[PDB]
Amino acid sequence: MHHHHHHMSGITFSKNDVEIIARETLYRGFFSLDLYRFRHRLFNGGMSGEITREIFERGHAAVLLPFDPVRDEVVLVEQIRIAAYDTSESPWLLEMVAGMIEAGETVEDVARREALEEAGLEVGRTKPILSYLASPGGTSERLSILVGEVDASTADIRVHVVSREQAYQWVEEGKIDNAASVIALQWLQLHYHNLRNEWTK
Amino acid sequence: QGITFSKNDVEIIARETLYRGFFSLDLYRFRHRLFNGGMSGEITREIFERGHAAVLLPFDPVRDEVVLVEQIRIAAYDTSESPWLLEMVAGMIEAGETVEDVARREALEEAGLEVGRTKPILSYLASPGGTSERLSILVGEVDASTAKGIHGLAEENEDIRVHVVSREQAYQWVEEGKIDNAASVIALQWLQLHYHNLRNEWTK
Numbered sequence: 001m002h003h004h005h006h007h008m009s010g011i012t013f014s015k016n017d018v019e020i021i022a023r024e025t026l027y028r029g030f031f032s033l034d035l036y037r038f039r040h041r042l043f044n045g046g047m048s049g050e051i052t053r054e055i056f057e058r059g060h061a062a063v064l065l066p067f068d069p070v071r072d073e074v075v076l077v078e079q080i081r082i083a084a085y086d087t088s089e090s091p092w093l094l095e096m097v098a099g100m101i102e103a104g105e106t107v108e109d110v111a112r113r114e115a116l117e118e119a120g121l122e123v124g125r126t127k128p129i130l131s132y133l134a135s136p137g138g139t140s141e142r143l144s145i146l147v148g149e150v151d152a153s154t155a156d157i158r159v160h161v162v163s164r165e166q167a168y169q170w171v172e173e174g175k176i177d178n179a180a181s182v183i184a185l186q187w188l189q190l191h192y193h194n195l196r197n198e199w200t201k
Numbered sequence: 202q203g204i205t206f207s208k209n210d211v212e213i214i215a216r217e218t219l220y221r222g223f224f225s226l227d228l229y230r231f232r233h234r235l236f237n238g239g240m241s242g243e244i245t246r247e248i249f250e251r252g253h254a255a256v257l258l259p260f261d262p263v264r265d266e267v268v269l270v271e272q273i274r275i276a277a278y279d280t281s282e283s284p285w286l287l288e289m290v291a292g293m294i295e296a297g298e299t300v301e302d303v304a305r306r307e308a309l310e311e312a313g314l315e316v317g318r319t320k321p322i323l324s325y326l327a328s329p330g331g332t333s334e335r336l337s338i339l340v341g342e343v344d345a346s347t348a349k350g351i352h353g354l355a356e357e358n359e360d361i362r363v364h365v366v367s368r369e370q371a372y373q374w375v376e377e378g379k380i381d382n383a384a385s386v387i388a389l390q391w392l393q394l395h396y397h398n399l400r401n402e403w404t405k
């Protein structure tokens with residue numbers, strides 16, 4: 001069909017449209033700094049020349065929003081995140097439960113495990129929220145968020161229990177400003193009414 | 202309620218460059234107060250340093266439309282169906298610049314868009330266990346009928362396609378996983394929570 005014209009044939013291109021020529025690990029410690037060399041299709045029709053990009057590689061994470069549907073409360077975990085220091089009033093952040101996903105593990109298994117270990121919470125039902133790329137211009141990291149049913153009365157890390165409304169107001173005010181928690185709590189603000197009905201049936 | 206400790210309670214002893222390239226990886230060495238009442242020992246953490254960004258959600262309040270930009274993000278490759286992503290206009294904030302200056306410049310360079318009024322959405326840490334990066338999101342008033350075509354600086358090997366969707370369509374794409382990068386998810390969830398008042402404010 002080479003005589004067929006271009007017009008006779010969401011996003012435009014797939015993995016068939018990129019060639020990763022080479023990968024190198026330039027730094028290996030707890031995390032890695034990798035270098036990708038690749039060429040890719042251009043929107044105008046041609047192929048790019050070879051492009052090189054640095055990629056921060058630290059694996060991928062499972063995240064759990066602990067929500068008590070009886071009490072309309074969320075459980076937050078506080079701990080120091082030194083990387084926040086230079087742009088934040090304090091490096092101690094209020095966050096969701098989270099942990100790295102190891103080979104062959106599922107998001108749900110990690111989320112449930114971490115909820116018990118960080119916050120001492122037994123999780124009942126879970127539902128997916130969303131899975132997102134934290135900052136794909138520079139890091140490969142993907143984080144997959146679930147909401148988990150908890151009894152908030154049963155709640156170096158410190159555990160905080162607050163109303164959903166307070167937690168969301170802290171997002172609005174900038175007092176909760178890490179991506180995983182912002183995404184989870186915005187989702188909860190959009191979905192809590194149906195979720196509470198589903199989980200208190 | 203709220204957090205327990207402040208910058209009075211942590212000392213950064215030193216920082217060491219582990220990798221110096223286009224971006225950097227630094228080792229922070231620090232000590233900090235513990236919730237149990239003591240002081241930690243010396244802690245180290247590897248931190249990815251890549252500066253900070255301004256992000257623009259281009260929203261047409263008359264048409265209830267959103268402008269997205271499509272381009273390859275190779276880091277997405279290993280965990281995504283395709284490394285081409287649908288994203289918000291964005292760019293790095295250089296020394297002395299304002300978030301608005303960058304957002305307006307990138308809106309023109311990445312999408313061919315002039316911007317009218319602007320309002321903050323939220324400023325967030327992308328992944329603060331391992332990177333310092335902060336991204337500050339604005340919503341910008343645009344005429345989505347002027348958003349079309351292929352943009353980006355060809356010299357910088359930047360190849361960007363503009364897409365226009367309705368707001369409801371963009372949000373549906375978030376729900377379905379077709380838009381799954383933090384900046385766009387945060388911006389579009391915010392828009393779902395605020396569009397009624399924002400359209401009223403900008404169509405008066």
Ligand SMILES: Nc1nc2c(ncn2[C@@H]2O[C@H](COP(=O)(O)O)[C@@H](O)[C@H]2O)c(=O)[nH]1
Binds near residue numbers: 358359
């Ligand atoms: N050499 C080099 N340039 C980069 C890298 N990441 C981004 N850039 C440059 O940053 C600009 C676009 O960055 P973006 O906003 O798409 O993340 C282009 O000038 C591009 O060449 C990298 O890892 N290495």
Ligand SMILES: Nc1nc2c(ncn2[C@@H]2O[C@H](COP(=O)(O)O)[C@@H](O)[C@H]2O)c(=O)[nH]1
Binds near residue numbers: 031244245246247330
């Ligand atoms: N112990 C330690 N872990 C580090 C360092 N830099 C990065 N990490 C990573 O951070 C992980 C702990 O993350 P956290 O549990 O604090 O969210 C470690 O398991 C390790 O992979 C470092 O200097 N020391």
Ligand SMILES: [Mg+2]
Binds near residue numbers: 292307
């Ligand atoms: Mg740009």
